[PDB]
Design a protein around this ligand. Sequence first.
Ligand code: GDP
Length: 261
Amino acid sequence: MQKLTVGLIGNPNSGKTTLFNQLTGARQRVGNWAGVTVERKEGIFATTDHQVTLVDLPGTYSLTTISSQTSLDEQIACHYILSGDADMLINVVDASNLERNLYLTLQLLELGIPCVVALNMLDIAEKQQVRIDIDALAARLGCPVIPLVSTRGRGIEALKIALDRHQANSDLELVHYPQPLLREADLLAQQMSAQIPPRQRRWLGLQMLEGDIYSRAYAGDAADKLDIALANLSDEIDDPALHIADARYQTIAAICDAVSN
Ligand SMILES: Nc1nc2c(ncn2[C@@H]2O[C@H](COP(=O)(O)OP(=O)(O)O)[C@@H](O)[C@H]2O)c(=O)[nH]1
């Protein structure tokens, strides 16, 4: 029995609290994110091989801020995910709004954090005549995808086995970004703290290029973005932030269509 730290993440209203309580029962403590007002719930449970600490993370639709005035809430889950204190994540997805929920899902697989998706609200999706091919969705995301109805407590056991068994998401060419954006995101990548693993480094350069406000603080060379963007003014010219998003959205668009009836 190894101790294992899992983060619980999701868009707001994906049924994350329900799930938190199904997993931890009465064994949960209420605290706050360090130096701040936002509440940090955390609790515990045991699968066949791990004694897990589950750390609830604030709802967010996206990790990336292109923006100024988002929130403190939405801005903290990035920070935690990137710190490494979590060994794997549970991604709570509202099956009834897949395409919209998968933006966040897809940023996490791009970060590379081991990840199991809790496809929650399978009953709401049926009531809307939405059928989803789970096996197919897992084959496209590269990570387990486990069916849930948190209200009833359906799937909690399979969600746990999944966590016992999953180690590493499948290594996938998920989003096709245009080459110049990549070339700069690696330029930006390769001049950053070596503790930060290579995928995450890359991901952050993409984020920097895209406009992310609070990403500049992990880089150690944002002294250096202004020139990345200029070297691009020729190439995938007008708008890096457009083509960056577009590529993720087409990815998620294609997935959703492969797999929803
Ligand atoms: N019908 C249905 N409702 C759910 C399911 N999961 C959570 N809910 C309900 O969805 C609403 C959102 O729940 P909550 O856990 O607070 O969402 P959170 O903000 O994302 O934590 C609540 O009324 C829950 O009772 C589910 O699988 N099916």
